[PDB]
Coordinates of N, CA and C and ligand atoms in Angstrom, one line a residue:
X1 N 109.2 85.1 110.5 CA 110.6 85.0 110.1 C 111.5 84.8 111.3
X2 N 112.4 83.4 111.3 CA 113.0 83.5 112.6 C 114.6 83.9 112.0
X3 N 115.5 84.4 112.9 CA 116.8 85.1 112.7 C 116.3 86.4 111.6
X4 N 115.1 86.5 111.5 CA 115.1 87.8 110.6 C 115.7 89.4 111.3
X5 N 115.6 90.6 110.9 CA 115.9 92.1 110.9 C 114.5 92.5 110.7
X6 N 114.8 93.8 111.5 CA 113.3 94.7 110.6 C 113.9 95.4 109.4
X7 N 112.7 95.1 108.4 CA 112.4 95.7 107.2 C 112.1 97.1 107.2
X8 N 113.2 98.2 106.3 CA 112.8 99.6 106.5 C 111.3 99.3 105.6
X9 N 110.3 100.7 106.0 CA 109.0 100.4 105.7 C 108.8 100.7 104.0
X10 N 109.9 100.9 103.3 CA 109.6 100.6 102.1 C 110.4 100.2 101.2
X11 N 110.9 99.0 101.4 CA 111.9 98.3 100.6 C 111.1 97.6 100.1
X12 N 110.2 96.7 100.6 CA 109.7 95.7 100.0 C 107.7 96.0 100.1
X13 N 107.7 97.3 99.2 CA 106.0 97.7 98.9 C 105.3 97.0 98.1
X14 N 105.5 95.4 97.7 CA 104.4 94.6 97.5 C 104.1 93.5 98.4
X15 N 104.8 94.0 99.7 CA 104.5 92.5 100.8 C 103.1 93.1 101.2
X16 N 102.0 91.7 101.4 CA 101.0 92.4 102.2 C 100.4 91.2 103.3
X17 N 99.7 92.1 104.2 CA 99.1 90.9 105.3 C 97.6 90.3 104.9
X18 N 97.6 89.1 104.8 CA 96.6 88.6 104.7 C 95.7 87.9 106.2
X19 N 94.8 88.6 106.5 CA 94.1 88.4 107.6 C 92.6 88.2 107.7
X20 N 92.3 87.4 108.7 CA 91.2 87.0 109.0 C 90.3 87.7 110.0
X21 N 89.3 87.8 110.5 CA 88.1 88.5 110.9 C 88.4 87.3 112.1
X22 N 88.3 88.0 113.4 CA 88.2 87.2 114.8 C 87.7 87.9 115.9
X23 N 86.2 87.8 116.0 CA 86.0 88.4 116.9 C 85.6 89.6 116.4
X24 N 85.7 90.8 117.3 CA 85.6 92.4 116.4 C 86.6 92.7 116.3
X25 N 88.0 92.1 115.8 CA 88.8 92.6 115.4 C 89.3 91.5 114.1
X26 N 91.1 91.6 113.8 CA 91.3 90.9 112.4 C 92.4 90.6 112.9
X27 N 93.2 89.3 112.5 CA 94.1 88.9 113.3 C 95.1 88.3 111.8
X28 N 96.5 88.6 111.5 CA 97.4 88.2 110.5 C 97.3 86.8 110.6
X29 N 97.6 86.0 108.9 CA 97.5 84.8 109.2 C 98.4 84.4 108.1
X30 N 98.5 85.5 107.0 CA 99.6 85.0 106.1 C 100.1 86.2 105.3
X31 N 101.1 86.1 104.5 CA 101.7 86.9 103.3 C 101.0 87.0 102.8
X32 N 101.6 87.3 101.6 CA 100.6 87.6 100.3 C 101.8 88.6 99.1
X33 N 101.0 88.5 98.1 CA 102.2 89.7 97.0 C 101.5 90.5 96.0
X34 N 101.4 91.6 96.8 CA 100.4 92.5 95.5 C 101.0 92.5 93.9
X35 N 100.2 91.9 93.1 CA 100.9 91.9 91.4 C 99.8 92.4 90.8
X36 N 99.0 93.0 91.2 CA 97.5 93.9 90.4 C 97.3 94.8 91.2
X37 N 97.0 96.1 91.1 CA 96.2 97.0 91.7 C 95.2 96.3 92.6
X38 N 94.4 95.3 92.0 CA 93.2 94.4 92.5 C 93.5 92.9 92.6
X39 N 94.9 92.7 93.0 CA 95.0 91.3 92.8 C 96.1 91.2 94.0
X40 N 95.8 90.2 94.3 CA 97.3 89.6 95.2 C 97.0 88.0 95.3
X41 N 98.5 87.3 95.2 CA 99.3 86.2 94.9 C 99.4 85.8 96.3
X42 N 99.4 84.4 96.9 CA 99.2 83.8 98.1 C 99.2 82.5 98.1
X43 N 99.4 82.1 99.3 CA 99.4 80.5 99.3 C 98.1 79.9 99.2
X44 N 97.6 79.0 98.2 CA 96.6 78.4 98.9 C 96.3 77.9 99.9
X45 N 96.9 77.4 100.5 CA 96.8 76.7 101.8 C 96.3 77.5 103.2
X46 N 97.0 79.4 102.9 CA 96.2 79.9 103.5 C 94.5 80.3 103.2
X47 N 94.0 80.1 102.3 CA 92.9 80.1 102.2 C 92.1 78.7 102.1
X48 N 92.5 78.0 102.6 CA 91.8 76.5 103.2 C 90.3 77.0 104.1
X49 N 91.2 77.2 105.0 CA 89.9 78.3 106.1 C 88.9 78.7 105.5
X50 N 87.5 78.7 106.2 CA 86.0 79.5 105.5 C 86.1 80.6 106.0
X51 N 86.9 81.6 106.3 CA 87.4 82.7 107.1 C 86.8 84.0 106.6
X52 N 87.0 84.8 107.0 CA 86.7 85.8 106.1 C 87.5 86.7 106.3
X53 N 88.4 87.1 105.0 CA 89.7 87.6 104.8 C 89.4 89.1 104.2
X54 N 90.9 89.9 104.7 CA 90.9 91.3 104.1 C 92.5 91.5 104.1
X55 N 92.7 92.1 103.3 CA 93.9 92.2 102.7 C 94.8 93.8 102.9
X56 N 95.8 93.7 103.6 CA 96.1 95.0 104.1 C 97.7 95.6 103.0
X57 N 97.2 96.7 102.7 CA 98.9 96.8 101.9 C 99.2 98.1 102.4
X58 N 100.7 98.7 102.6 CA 100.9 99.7 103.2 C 101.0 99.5 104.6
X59 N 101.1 97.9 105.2 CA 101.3 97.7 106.1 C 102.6 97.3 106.7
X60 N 103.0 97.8 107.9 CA 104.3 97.5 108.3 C 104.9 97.3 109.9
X61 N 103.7 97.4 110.4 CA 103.1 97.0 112.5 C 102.2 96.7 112.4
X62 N 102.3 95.8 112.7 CA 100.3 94.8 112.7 C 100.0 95.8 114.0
X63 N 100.4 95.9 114.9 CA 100.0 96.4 116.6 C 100.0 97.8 116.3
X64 N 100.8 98.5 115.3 CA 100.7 100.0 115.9 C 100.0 100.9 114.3
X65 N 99.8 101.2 114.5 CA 99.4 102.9 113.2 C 99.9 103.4 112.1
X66 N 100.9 103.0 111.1 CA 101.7 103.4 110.5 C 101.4 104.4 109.7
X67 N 100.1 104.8 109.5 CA 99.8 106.1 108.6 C 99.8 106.2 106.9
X68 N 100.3 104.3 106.7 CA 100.3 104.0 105.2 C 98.8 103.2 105.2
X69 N 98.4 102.1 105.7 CA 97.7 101.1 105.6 C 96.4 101.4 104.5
X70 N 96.2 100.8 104.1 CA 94.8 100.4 103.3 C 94.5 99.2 103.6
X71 N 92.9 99.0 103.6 CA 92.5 98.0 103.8 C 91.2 97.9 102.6
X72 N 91.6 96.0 102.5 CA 90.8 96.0 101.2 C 90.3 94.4 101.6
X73 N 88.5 94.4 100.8 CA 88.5 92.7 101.5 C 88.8 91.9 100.9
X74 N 88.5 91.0 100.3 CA 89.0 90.0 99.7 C 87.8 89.8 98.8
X75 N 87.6 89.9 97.2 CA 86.3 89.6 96.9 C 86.1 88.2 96.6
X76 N 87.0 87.8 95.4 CA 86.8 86.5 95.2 C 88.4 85.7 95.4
X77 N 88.1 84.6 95.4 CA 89.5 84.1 96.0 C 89.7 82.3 94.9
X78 N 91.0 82.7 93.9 CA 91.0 81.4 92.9 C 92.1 80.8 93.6
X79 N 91.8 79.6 93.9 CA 93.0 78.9 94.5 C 93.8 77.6 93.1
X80 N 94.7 77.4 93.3 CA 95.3 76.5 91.7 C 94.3 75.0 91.6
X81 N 93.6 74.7 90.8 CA 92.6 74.0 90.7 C 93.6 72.5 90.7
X82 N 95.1 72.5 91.3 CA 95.6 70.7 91.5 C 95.6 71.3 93.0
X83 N 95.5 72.1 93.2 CA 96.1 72.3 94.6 C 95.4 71.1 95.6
X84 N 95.7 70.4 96.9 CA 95.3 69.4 97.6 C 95.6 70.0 99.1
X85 N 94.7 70.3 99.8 CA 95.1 70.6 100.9 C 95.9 69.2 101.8
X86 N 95.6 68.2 101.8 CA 96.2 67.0 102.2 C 97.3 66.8 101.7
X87 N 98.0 67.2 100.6 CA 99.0 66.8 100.0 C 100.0 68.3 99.7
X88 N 100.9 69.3 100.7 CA 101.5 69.9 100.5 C 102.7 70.1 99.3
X89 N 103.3 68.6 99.6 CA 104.7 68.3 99.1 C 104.3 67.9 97.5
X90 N 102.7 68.2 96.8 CA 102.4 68.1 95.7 C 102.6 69.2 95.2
X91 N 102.4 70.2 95.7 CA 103.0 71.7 94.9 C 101.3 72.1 94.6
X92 N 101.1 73.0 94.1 CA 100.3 73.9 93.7 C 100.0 74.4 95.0
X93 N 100.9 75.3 95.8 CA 100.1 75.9 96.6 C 100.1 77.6 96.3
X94 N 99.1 77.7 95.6 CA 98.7 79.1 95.1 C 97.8 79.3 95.0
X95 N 97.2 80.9 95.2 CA 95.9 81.1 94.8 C 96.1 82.8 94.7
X96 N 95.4 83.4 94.0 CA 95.2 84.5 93.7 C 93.7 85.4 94.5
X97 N 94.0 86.1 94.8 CA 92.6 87.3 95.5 C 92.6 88.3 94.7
X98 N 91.0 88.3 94.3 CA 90.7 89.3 93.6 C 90.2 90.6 94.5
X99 N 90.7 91.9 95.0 CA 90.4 92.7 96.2 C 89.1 93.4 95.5
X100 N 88.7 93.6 96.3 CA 87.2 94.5 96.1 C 87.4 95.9 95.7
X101 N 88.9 96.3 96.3 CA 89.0 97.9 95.8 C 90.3 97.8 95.2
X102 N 90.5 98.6 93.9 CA 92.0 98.7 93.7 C 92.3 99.3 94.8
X103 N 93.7 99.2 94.9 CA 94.8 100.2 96.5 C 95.4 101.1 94.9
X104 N 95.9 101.9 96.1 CA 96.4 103.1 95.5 C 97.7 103.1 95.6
X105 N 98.9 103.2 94.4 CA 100.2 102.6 94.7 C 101.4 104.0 95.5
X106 N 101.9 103.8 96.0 CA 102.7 104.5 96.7 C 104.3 104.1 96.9
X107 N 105.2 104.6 97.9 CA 106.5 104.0 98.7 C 106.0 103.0 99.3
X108 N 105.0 102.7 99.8 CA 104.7 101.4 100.3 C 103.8 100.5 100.2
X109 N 103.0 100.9 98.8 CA 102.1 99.9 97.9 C 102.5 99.6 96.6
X110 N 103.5 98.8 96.2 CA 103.7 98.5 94.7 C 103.5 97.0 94.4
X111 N 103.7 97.0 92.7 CA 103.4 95.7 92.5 C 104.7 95.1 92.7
X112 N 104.5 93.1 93.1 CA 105.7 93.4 93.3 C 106.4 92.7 91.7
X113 N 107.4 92.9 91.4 CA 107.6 92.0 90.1 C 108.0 90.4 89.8
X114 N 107.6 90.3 89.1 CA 107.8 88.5 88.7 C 108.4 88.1 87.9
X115 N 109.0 86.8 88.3 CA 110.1 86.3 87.3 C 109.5 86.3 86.0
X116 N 110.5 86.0 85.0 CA 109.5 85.4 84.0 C 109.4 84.1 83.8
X117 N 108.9 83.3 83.0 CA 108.5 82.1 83.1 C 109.5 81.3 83.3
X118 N 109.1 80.2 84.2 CA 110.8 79.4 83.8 C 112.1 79.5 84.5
X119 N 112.0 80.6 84.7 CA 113.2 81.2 85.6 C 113.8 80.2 86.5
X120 N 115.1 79.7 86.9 CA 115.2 79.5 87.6 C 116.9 79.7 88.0
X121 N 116.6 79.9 89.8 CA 118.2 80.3 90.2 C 119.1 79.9 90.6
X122 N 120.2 79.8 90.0 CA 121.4 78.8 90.1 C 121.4 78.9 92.0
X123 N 121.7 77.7 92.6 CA 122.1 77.4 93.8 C 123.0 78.7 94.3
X124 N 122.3 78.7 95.5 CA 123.0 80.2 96.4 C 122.5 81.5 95.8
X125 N 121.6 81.9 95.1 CA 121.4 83.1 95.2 C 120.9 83.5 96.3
X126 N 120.8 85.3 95.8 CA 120.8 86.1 97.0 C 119.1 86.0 97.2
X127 N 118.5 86.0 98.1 CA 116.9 86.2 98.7 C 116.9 86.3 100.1
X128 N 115.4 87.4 100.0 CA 115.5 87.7 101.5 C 113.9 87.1 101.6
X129 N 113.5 86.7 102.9 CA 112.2 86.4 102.9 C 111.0 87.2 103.3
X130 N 110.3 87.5 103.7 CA 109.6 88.9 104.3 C 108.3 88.2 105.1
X131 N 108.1 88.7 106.0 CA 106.8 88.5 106.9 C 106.8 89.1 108.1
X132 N 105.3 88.7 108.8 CA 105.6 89.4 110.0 C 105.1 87.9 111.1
X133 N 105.4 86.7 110.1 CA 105.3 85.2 110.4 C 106.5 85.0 112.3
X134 N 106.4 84.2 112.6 CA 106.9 83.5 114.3 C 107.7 83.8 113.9
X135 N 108.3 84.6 114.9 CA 110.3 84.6 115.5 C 110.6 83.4 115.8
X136 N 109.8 82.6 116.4 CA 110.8 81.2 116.9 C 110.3 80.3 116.1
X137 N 110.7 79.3 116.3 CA 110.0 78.0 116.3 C 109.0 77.9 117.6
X138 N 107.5 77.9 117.4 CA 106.5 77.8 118.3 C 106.7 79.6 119.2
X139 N 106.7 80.3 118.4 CA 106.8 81.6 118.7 C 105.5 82.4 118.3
X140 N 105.6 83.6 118.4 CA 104.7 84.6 118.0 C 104.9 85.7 117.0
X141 N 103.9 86.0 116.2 CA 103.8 86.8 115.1 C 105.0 87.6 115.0
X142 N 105.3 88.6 114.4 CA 106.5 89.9 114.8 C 105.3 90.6 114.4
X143 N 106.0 91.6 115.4 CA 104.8 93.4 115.4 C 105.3 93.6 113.9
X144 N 107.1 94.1 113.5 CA 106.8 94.7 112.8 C 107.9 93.5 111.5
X145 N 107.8 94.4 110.5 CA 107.9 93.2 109.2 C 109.1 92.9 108.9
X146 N 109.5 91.6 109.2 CA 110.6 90.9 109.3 C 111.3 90.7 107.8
X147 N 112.9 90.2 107.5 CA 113.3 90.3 106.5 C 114.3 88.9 106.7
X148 N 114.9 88.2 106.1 CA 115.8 87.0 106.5 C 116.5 86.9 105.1
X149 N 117.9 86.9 105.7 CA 118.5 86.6 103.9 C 118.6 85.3 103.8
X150 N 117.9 84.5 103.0 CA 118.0 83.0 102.4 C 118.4 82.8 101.0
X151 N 119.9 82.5 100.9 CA 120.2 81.9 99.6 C 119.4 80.7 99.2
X152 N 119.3 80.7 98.1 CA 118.2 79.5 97.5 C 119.4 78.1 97.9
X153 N 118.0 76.8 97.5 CA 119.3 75.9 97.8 C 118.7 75.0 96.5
X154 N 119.3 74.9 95.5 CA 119.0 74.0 94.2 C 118.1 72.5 94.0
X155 N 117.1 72.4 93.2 CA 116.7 71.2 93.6 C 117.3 70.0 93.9
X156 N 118.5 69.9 92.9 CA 119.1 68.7 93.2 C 119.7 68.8 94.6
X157 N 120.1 69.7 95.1 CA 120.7 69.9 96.5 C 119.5 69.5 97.3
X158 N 118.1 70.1 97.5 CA 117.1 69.8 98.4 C 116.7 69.5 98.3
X159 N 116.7 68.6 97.1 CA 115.6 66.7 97.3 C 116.6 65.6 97.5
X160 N 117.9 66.3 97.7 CA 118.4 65.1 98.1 C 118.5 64.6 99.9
X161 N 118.6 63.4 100.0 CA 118.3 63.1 100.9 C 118.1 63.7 102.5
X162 N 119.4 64.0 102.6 CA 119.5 64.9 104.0 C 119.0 66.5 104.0
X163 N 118.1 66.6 102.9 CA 117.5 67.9 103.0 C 116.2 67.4 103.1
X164 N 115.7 67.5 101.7 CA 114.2 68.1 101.8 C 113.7 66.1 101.3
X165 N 114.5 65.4 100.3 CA 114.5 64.1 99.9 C 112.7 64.7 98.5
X166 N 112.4 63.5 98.9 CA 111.1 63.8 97.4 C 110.0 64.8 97.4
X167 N 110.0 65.4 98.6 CA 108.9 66.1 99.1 C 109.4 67.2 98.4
X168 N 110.5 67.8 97.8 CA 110.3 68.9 97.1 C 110.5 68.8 95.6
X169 N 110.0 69.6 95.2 CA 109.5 69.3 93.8 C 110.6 70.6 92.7
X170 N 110.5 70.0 91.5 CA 110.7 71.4 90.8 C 110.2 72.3 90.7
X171 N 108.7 72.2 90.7 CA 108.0 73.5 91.3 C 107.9 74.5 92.2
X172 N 109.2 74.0 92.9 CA 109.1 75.1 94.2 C 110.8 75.6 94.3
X173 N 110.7 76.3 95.3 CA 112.4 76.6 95.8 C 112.5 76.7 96.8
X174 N 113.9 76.3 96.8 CA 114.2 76.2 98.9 C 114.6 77.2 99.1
X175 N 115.0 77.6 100.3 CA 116.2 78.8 100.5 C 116.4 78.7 101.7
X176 N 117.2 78.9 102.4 CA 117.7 79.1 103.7 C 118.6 77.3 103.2
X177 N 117.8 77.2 105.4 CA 118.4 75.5 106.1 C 119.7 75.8 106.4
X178 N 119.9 77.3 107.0 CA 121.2 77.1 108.0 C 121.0 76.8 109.6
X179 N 120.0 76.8 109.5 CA 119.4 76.5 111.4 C 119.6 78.0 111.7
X180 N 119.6 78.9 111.3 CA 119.3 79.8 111.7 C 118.0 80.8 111.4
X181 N 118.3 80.7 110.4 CA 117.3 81.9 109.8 C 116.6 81.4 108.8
X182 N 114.6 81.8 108.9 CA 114.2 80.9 107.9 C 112.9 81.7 107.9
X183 N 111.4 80.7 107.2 CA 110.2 81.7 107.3 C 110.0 80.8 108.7
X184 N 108.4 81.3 109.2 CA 107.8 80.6 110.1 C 106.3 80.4 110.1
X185 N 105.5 79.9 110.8 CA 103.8 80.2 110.4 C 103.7 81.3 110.4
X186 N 103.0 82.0 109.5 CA 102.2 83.4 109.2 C 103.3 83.8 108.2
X187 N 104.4 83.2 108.1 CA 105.2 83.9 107.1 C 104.5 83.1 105.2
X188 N 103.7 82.2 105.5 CA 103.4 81.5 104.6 C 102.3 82.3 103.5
X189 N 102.3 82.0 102.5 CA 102.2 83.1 101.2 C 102.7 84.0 100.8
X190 N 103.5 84.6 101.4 CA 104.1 85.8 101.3 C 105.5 85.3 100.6
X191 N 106.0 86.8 99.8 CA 107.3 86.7 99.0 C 108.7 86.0 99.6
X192 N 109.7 85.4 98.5 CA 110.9 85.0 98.7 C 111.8 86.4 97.2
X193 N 111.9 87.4 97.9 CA 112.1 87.9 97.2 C 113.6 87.8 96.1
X194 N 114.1 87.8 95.4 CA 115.8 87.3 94.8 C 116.0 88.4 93.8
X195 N 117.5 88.8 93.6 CA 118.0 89.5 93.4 C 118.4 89.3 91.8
X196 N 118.0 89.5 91.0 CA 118.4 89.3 89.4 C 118.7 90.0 88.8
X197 N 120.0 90.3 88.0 CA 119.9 91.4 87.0 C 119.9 92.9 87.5
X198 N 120.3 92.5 89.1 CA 119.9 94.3 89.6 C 118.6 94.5 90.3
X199 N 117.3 93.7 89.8 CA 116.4 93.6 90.6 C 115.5 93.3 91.6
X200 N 114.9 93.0 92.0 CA 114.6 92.0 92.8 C 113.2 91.5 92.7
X201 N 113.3 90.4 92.2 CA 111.6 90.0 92.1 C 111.0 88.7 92.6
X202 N 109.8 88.6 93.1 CA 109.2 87.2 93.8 C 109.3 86.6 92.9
X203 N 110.2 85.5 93.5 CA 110.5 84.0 93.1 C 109.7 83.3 93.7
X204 N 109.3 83.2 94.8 CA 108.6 82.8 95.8 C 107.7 82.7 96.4
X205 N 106.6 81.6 96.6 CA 104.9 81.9 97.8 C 105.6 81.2 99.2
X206 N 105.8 81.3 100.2 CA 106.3 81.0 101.1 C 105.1 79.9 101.4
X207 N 105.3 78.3 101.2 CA 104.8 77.0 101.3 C 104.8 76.1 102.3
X208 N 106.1 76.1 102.7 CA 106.0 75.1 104.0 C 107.4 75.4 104.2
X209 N 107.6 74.6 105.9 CA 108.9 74.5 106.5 C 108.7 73.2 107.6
X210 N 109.5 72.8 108.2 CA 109.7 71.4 108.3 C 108.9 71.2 109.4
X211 N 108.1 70.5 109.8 CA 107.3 70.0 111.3 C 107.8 70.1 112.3
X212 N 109.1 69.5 112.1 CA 110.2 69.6 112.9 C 110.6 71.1 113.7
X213 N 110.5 71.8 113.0 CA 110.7 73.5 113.4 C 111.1 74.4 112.7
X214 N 110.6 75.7 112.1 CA 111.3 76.7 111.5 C 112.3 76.6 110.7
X215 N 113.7 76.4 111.8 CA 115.1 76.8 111.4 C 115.8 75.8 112.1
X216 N 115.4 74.7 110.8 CA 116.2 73.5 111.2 C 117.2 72.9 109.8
X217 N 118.3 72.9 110.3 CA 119.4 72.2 109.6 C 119.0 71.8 108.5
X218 N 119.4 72.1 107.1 CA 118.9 71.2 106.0 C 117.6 71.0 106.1
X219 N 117.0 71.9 106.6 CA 115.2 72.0 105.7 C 115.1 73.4 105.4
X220 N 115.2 73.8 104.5 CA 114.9 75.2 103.9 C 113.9 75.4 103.6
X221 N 113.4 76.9 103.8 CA 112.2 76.8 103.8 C 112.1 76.5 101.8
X222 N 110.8 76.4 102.1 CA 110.1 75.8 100.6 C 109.0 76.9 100.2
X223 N 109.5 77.1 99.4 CA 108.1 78.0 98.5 C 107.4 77.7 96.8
X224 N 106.9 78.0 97.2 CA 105.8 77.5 95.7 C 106.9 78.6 94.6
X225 N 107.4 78.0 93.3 CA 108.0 78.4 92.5 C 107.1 79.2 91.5
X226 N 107.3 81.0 91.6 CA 106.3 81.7 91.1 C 106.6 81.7 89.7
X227 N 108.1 81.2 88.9 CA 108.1 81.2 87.5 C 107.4 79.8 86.7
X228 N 106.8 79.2 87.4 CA 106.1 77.8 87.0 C 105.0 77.9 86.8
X229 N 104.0 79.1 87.4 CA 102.6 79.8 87.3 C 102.8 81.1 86.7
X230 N 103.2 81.5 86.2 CA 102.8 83.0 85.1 C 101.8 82.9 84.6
X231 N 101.6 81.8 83.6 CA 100.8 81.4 82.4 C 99.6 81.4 83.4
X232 N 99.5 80.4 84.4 CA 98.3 80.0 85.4 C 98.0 81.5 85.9
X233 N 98.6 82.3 86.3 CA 98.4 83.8 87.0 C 97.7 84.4 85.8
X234 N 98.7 84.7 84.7 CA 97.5 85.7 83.4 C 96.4 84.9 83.4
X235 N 96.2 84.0 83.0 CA 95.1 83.3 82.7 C 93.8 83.3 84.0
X236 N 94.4 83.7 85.0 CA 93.3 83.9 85.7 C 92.9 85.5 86.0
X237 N 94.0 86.1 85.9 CA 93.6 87.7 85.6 C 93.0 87.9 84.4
X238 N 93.2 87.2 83.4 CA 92.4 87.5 82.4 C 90.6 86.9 82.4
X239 N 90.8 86.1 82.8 CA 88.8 85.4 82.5 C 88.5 85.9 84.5
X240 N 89.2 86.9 85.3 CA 88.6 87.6 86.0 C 88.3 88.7 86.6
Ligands
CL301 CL1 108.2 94.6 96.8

């Protein structure tokens, strides 16, 4: 998250780190959104990799101890069967992890909630984004878990030209594109959280941001629109 704040450690208890096995240790590589005891919501694109992933919730310093953490591996992993690793700006970047252990819910393990189907938010609402994704453009991880407020920016607004143009789809949502504050690599899968009705629930799989850099003018970040997959999400918690 670049221009982000740190996140108090339990505002947002369905963010989780999704990481990879490197060496004898495990190294963060994306978001993620616990919505099952035994399930978490992610980008597909971070599971492109033959990697071998484990899923941390209750986490809130990748570098230091926090005294919440669980760790759980990854058992099976359903990625959205259009999804195209070659073709981003096609949308389906989702996939679901099925974790090997349920986690135990706490102040800093909850599910997080989801739109419902369909949903979508009028231009400029309120969202914050969450990771512990690059401070800069071409930056490094954040120790601890970053927060960015990004108003949404409406499709018609960021497919049009001097934004996002065709690459974004109805399927997704923008937010930010003030050149300031936005997601960044590692912030990808992880929540766009938005404020509805009082609540606040993932709208968002954090999907892409511009080649160009982070937090650039009129590219907001883009996330995979989580009220367009409900049906695709039950349906795979159910037959798994
Ligand atoms: Cl949450």
């Amino acid at each position: 998250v670049v221009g982000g704040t740190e996140a108090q450690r339990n505002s947002w208890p369905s963010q989780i780190s999704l990481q990879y096995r490197s060496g004898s240790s495990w190294a963060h590589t994306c978001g993620g959104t616990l919505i099952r005891q035994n399930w978490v919501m992610t980008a597909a694109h971070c599971v492109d990799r033959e990697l071998t992933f484990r899923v941390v919730v209750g986490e809130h310093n990748l570098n230091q101890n926090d005294g919440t953490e669980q760790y759980v591996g990854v058992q099976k992993i359903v990625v959205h069967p259009y999804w195209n690793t070659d073709d981003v700006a096609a949308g389906y970047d989702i996939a679901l992890l099925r974790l090997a252990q349920s986690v135990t819910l706490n102040s800093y393990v909850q599910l997080g909630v989801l739109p419902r189907a369909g949903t979508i938010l009028a231009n400029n609402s309120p969202c914050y984004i969450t990771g512990w994704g690059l401070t800069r453009t071409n930056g490094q991880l954040a120790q601890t878990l970053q927060q960015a407020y990004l108003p949404t920016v409406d499709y018609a607004i960021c497919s049009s030209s001097s934004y996002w143009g065709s690459t974004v789809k109805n399927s997704m949502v923008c937010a930010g594109g003030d050149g300031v504050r936005s997601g960044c690599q590692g912030d990808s899968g992880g929540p766009l959280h938005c404020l509805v009705n009082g609540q606040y629930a993932v709208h968002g799989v954090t999907s892409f941001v511009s080649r160009l850099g982070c937090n650039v003018t009129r590219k907001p970040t883009v996330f995979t629109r989580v009220s367009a997959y409900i049906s695709w999400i039950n349906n795979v918690i159910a037959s798994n």
